[PDB]
Design a protein around this ligand. Structure first.
Ligand code: ZN
Ligand code: ZN
Ligand code: ZN
Ligand code: ZN
Lengths: 159, 93, 13, 62, 106, 49, 103, 49, 56, 139, 27, 317
């Protein structure tokens, strides 16, 4: 009873679903776009809008209130912004995984180098666990060094 | 209250004491979560009594949770690294 | 002219 | 050299095959009514509408 | 203080242009025999892209900038300002065509 | 003169026995605050290795 | 009229380097110098004043019409110096209420 | 205004040959290393194995 | 404005390096991003690992 | 082998010409060009196939590529997908001076370079392609 | 003498209803 | 190596690279060509100085190109800057009788030359904004009032309108859009995904089912938003910014909608509308009144703020 009243029902967490954030989701959950490197407006308080300390991102000051939710410092959780990159870059934690996926598929026509016709591939398909499934598929398709224009009847391969 | 003390309280079987130590005697925080995306992106104005997840575009399926402030910080840092930890209040199967 | 002055292989590096 | 210049002309064209298309594109790229310059709710506040001219020209007390 | 001659593209100090004139354009501009207004109209102190050329004959850069028939020295890729209409007409009288180096003409 | 003065003063004050910018990956604790709780402790600190 | 004048953006633009209480004093002095023009300077805010005890029972258009006809009567009683109104925009507030003229 | 004491640092002597035995998971079985220091200034220069 | 491919490659590698060291400054086989004082930058990854990390 | 590929590429050429004629007629009849977009996936899959490049150059498919790239008389540019796919295919194939002479794609390339409604990235790629094609002529 | 009260069930004016202090009893 | 020998500015490592032959033309290509030169009569903004941000007309361009004489609105107090206002000769004489005169309509006050109420003062090239200029009706009227014809000139103003209309258009997934140019002209579709800010994948809607299952990436320069009657839309920019409501009448470019806050019909251009199904307007940092403030309405009236709005309040007596 140390929190101000809220009409939202109180529940507990039963499941945590992990995943990656899509660019559409990042743009949608954002409240402002960050494009100005200068932190301060004119070195005379009142930080610049569109900067890294925009007042819509949240309030960390006693006497100021968040301009997004209107709550005080104690209650505001903070809000996210986004920053459009001029060119796409690698996520440092996924570079080996990107490499393995690049090995697994074909760089021209975005298709796996092998199909379910191979019984070993079917067995690799059967395992439910995504990590082990990826491991098996990668262990198979790593050897295959040529996209197949026709079936080893065209499988869509570019050759 | 380190990890070994936590293990001793687990060995005693006192779950309520452990929860009270780690929440009421420490960083207890209240957040709102969307019932659809499961993200902490709800914009709540409690005195105006209006809740909204702008992304999912919903105003009715919103819940409140009591979590440690360090857990909130961890989820926000994970979000900063493009990971999406989604908190749901029901099981699926 | 201007178009003819585009570099070739034998031009200095 | 003249022969390779003629070959370049043959391969790449003098532009006359699509100079008229370029002229049409430039004509359509190029184009006043106050109803489209500012909002009607701003025109009304500034007394710039036709009705304000009608009120101002009519010989009666406003 | 340095200025870039609009016609030939060479860069020399403004006092050098006033006292001695442009070593290349003196056959058609008479910059040394010209007052400060004509010097300003043909040499501009606002420029960009300093170029030093050692061998005009074989440098592709000199041919690309049309300075392979001139004295080696400091040259500018782009020069702010254009020649006046009367000076352009005077050059056309001599039979020499003036190609602007302002970049706006290509 | 500020180079030698500041370098010697920094190294003796902080105990990092190297250049200030090279503080990372440098020997530390070469210089310590003298112990003055009792006379014997001062003697022991002055004869330590 | 002073309490509404001190918050008006026109007063703030007129005296950017002055506090609110200075604007209150200026409003009081202007009210002493010319009550009519100070009432006119309120524009839409003069319908929110305490005019009558039961003024809330009237429709808004009726109250506006009554106030405007009273202003027209009083302004035409006083008269407007046309050259001053042409030069000083403060004195031009009474020109739309001249008989035969309008906003 | 703070009293600082320098602590003596213990190091291995220079200009002496030391022979050591490398461990089993290594092609090398023995090593003979010497660290050389000029007499003037007593500063390490080079290491030869 | 103007695109010499070498300069594009240099500046885009600088951007990639900044984005990578914003999340992980313990990348093996390359120098760390440093502060003006010479101390290495505290990345998001280093906030979550160790005894003093977020979890432990 | 190669003859079957030549026959299939010629059939694709006839289908592309028929689709272009149908789309032009529909545009003249007040209907959007849809046939080119429908035929685009098959053309893209064929063009991405590397071993068919020799057969494409033998059958002069670049003429129909130019025809698709040719703006219609109503001064309306083709869909961005068609332009992007054809530009990517042009990059992916080794176009020589003889093939350019056979097809006459240089005129449309110069038009795309000079035009302003075209995307600047496509403008830069067209400039690069024109420079690369002028490279063997002077050396 | 007027008390401005905030209430949960009166949704008509977001809980704000005006009553005199003489009409109420404290709990 | 011989050329770099004997130089100290060269770094220790031999950081030399082979420039590609195609890059040779690019290394010497000119810059700043967009603008052959500054055109007289154009309206520009001032970067700094006492008239920082005030729009100024380029009456004269100096041949040197480093400065230019401009037509400005004076900022004086006549004896922290005063608000811009047309130069009043009478007030200037009253507060300072040392005015000098040189011609008819050309007035010199305090060393500054004012022509018919407008300042004419030279300003440097490094003090001006010649692009992304945002004009205001007030300043436009104030500049064209002296020509005895209201805003007679509308070419540069129309260009500014075109630029603002093009830049203010931002798209979101699920938006109904219409195509202006290209072979797909006069077609309706829904935005599926947005990539960067110039390529938008749109799924078209048509009577044929096979066409409705295709996604087409279309440039944003040839898309116009489709606003249907009875949709919640939130204003992006303008005098009615952050106003929401339901669309009532769609008169092509101009859209009319009943507001939610003021609950009255508002006419705003379609370029200033975004389909936002909920308002969620925050009234913080506005007015002088927090929610539930006990406000004195007048001499003998008081109340409590019940709901708060951008330019109005609801008070319970
Ligand atoms: Zn907030
Ligand atoms: Zn493939
Ligand atoms: Zn949600
Ligand atoms: Zn010269």
């Amino acid at each position: 009873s140390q929190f101000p009243y809220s009409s939202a029902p109180l529940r507990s967490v039963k499941e945590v679903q992990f995943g990656l954030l899509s660019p559409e989701e990042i743009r949608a959950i954002s409240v402002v776009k960050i494009e100005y490197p200068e932190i301060m407006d004119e070195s005379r308080q009142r930080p610049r809008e569109g900067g890294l300390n925009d007042p819509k991102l949240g309030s960390i000051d006693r006497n100021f209130k968040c301009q997004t939710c209107g709550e005080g410092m104690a209650e505001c959780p903070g809000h996210f912004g986004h920053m459009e990159l001029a060119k796409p870059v690698f996520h440092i934690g996924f570079i080996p995984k990107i490499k393995k996926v690049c090995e697994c598929i074909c760089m021209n026509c975005g298709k796996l180098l092998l199909d379910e016709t191979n019984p070993t591939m079917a067995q690799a398909i059967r395992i439910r666990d995504p990590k082990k499934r990826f491991n098996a598929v990668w262990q198979l398709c790593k050897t295959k060094m040529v996209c197949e224009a026709d079936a080893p009847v065209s499988r869509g391969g570019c050759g | 209250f380190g990890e070994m003390e936590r293990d001793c309280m687990i060995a005693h079987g006192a779950a309520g004491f452990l929860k009270e130590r780690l929440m009421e005697a420490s960083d207890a925080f209240r957040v709102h979560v969307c019932g659809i995306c499961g993200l902490m992106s709800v914009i709540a104005n409690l005195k105006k009594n209006q809740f909204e997840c702008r992304s999912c575009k919903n105003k009715t399926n919103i819940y409140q949770l009591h979590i440690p402030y360090a857990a909130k910080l961890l989820f926000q840092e994970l979000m900063a690294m493009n990971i999406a930890p989604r908190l749901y209040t029901e099981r699926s199967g | 002219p201007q178009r003819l002055l585009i570099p070739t292989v034998d031009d200095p590096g | 050299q003249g022969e390779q210049y003629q070959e370049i002309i043959e391969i790449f064209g003098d532009g006359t095959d699509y100079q008229w298309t370029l002229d049409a594109e430039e004509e359509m790229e190029q184009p006043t009514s106050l109803a489209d310059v500012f909002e009607p709710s701003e025109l009304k506040e500034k007394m710039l509408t036709d009705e304000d001219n009608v009120i101002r020209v009519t010989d009666l007390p406003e | 203080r340095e200025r870039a001659c609009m016609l030939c593209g060479i860069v020399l100090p403004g006092r050098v242009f006033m006292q001695n004139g442009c070593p290349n354009c003196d056959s058609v501009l008479n910059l040394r025999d010209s007052d400060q207004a004509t010097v300003n109209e043909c040499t501009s102190s606002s420029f960009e892209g300093l170029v030093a050329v050692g061998d005009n004959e074989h440098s592709w850069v000199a041919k690309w900038l049309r300075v392979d028939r001139f004295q080696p020295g400091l040259y500018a890729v782009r020069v702010d300002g254009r020649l006046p209409s009367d000076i352009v007409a005077a050059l056309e009288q001599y039979g020499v065509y003036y190609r602007p180096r302002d970049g706006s003409v290509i | 003169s500020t180079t030698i003065t500041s370098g010697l003063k920094y190294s003796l004050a902080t105990g990092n026995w190297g250049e200030q910018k090279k503080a990372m990956s440098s020997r530390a604790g070469v210089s310590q605050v003298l112990n003055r709780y009792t006379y014997s402790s001062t003697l022991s600190h002055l004869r330590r290795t | 009229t002073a309490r509404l004048y001190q918050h008006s953006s026109k007063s703030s633009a007129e005296y950017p380097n002055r506090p609110q209480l200075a604007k209150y004093c200026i409003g009081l002095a202007k009210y002493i110098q010319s009550p009519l023009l100070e009432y006119l300077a309120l524009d839409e805010s003069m319908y929110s004043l305490h005019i009558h005890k039961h003024q809330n029972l009237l429709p808004r258009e009726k109250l506006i019409d009554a106030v405007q006809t009273s202003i027209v009567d009083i302004v035409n009683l006083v008269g407007v110096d046309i050259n001053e109104a042409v030069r000083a925009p403060y004195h031009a507030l009474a020109l739309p209420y001249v008989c035969g003229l309008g906003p | 205004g703070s009293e600082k004491v320098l602590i003596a640092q213990e190091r291995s002597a220079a200009n002496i040959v030391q022979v050591f035995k490398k461990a089993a998971p290594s092609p090398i079985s023995h090593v003979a290393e010497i660290r050389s220091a000029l007499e003037k200034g007593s500063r390490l220069i080079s290491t030869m194995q | 404005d103007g695109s010499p491919q070498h300069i594009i490659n240099e500046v885009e590698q600088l951007l990639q390096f900044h984005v990578a060291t914003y999340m992980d400054n313990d990348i093996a086989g390359q120098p760390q991003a440093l502060q003006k004082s010479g101390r290495p930058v505290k990345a998001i990854r280093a906030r979550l690992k160790g005894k003093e990390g977020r979890l432990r | 082998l190669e003859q079957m590929q030549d026959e299939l590429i010629q059939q694709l050429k006839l289908q592309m010409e028929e689709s272009a004629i149908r789309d032009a007629n529909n545009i003249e009849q007040g209907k959007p060009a849809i046939f080119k977009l429908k035929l685009l996936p098959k053309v893209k899959d064929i063009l991405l196939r590397a071993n068919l490049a020799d057969s494409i150059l033998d059958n002069n498919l670049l003429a129909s590529v130019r025809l698709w790239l040719e703006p219609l008389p109503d001064a309306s540019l083709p869909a961005y997908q068609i332009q992007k796919v054809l530009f990517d295919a042009i990059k992916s194939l080794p176009i020589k001076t003889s093939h350019l002479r056979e097809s006459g794609l240089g005129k449309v390339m110069v038009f795309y370079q000079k035009s302003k409604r075209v995307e600047p990235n496509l403008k830069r790629t067209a400039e690069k392609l024109i420079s690369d094609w002028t490279r063997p002529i002077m050396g | 003498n007027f008390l401005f009260l905030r209430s949960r069930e009166i949704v008509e004016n977001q809980g704000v209803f005006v009553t005199s202090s003489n009409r109420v009893k404290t709990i | 190596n011989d050329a770099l020998k004997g130089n100290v500015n060269v770094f220790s490592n031999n950081s030399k690279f082979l420039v590609g032959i195609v890059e040779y033309k690019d290394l010497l290509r000119p810059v700043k060509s967009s603008d052959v030169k500054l055109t007289r009569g154009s309206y520009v903004r001032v970067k700094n100085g006492k008239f920082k941000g005030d729009l100024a007309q380029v009456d004269e361009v100096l041949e040197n190109g480093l400065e230019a004489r401009l037509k400005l609105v004076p900022r004086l107090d006549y004896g922290f800057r005063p608000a811009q206002r047309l130069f009043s000769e009478a007030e200037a004489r009253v507060h300072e009788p040392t005015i000098r005169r040189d011609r008819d309509g050309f007035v010199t006050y305090g060393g500054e030359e004012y022509y018919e109420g407008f300042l004419y003062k030279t300003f440097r090239l490094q003090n001006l904004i010649v692009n992304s200029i945002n004009p205001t009706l007030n300043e436009l009227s104030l500049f064209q009032s002296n020509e005895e014809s209201t805003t007679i000139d509308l070419s540069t103003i129309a260009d500014s309108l075109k630029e603002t209309a093009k830049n203010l258009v931002s798209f979101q997934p699920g938006d109904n859009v219409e195509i202006i140019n290209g072979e797909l002209n006069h077609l309706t579709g829904t935005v599926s995904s947005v990539n960067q800010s110039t390529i938008v994948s749109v799924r078209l809607h048509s009577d044929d089912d096979t066409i409705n299952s295709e996604t087409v990436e279309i440039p944003t320069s040839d898309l116009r938003k489709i606003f249907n009657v009875g949709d919640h839309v939130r204003v992006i920019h303008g005098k009615h910014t952050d106003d929401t409501g339901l669309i009532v009448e769609v008169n092509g470019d101009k859209v009319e909608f009943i507001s939610n806050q003021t609950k009255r019909t508002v006419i705003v251009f379609s370029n200033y509308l975004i389909k936002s199904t909920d308002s969620t307007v925050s009234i913080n940092e506005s007015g002088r009144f927090e929610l539930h403030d006990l406000v004195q309405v007048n001499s003998d009236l008081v109340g409590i703020v019940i709901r708060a709005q951008k330019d109005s309040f609801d008070v319970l007596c």
